[PDB]
């Protein structure tokens, strides 16, 4: 904690170094996609692999 500091408070043993903050808040994209906040709005899913 002293060496690397944190993403919000400066490191004690590195002057003015804040841990880089992630580009995305959550990396569990599949749970985002299958979440109710998304699956409730998506239009009727088209067919998967189809017959010729």
């Amino acid at each position: 904690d002293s060496v690397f500091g944190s993403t919000t408070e400066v490191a004690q043993l590195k002057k003015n170094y804040f841990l880089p903050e992630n580009i995305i808040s959550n990396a569990d994209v599949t749970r985002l996609i299958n979440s109710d906040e998304i699956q409730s709005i998506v239009k009727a899913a088209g067919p998967s692999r189809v017959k010729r």
């Binding site: 804040f18 995305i24 808040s25 985002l32 906040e37």
Partner: protein, 133 residues
């Protein structure tokens, strides 16, 4: 274009998420983000807290609680000392800009958070950074 030129895995997750949102819904906002996430770094100019504050409290206002959305960097503007309460979603916030929003104001969001909040992009302003550079 059909894919982003970066190798950032976290950016590719955004592309994966928003490909689904664009092709499984009719929201043109999702298509707009997908086209802009594919763009190169110099085609995604920064935006400033000063500009966003001006663009919200502009003329008839009409901002209220609408979350501002920009695909790029949200830099700070030290020329302003009064920062209003704002809700902003972007790829990345500079350290100074994030602190100024949080300490006196509203919230900062990432694009995946915005999708879990407004997947159709309802009640958002889709600002863009100045391409004059």
């Amino acid at each position: 274009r059909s894919k982003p030129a970066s190798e950032n895995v976290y950016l590719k997750l955004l592309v994966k998420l928003y490909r689904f949102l664009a092709r499984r819904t009719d929201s043109r906002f999702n298509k707009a983000i997908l086209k802009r996430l594919f763009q190169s770094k110099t085609n995604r100019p920064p935006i400033s807290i000063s500009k966003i504050a001006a663009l919200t409290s502009r003329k008839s206002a009409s901002s209220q609680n609408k979350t501002t959305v920009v695909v790029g960097t949200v830099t700070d503007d030290e020329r302003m000392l009064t920062v209003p309460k704002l809700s902003i979603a972007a790829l990345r916030f500079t350290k100074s800009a994030r602190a100024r929003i949080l300490k006196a104001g509203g919230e900062v969001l990432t694009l995946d958070q915005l999708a879990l909040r407004a997947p159709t992009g309802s009640n958002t302003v889709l600002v863009r950074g100045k391409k004059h550079a």
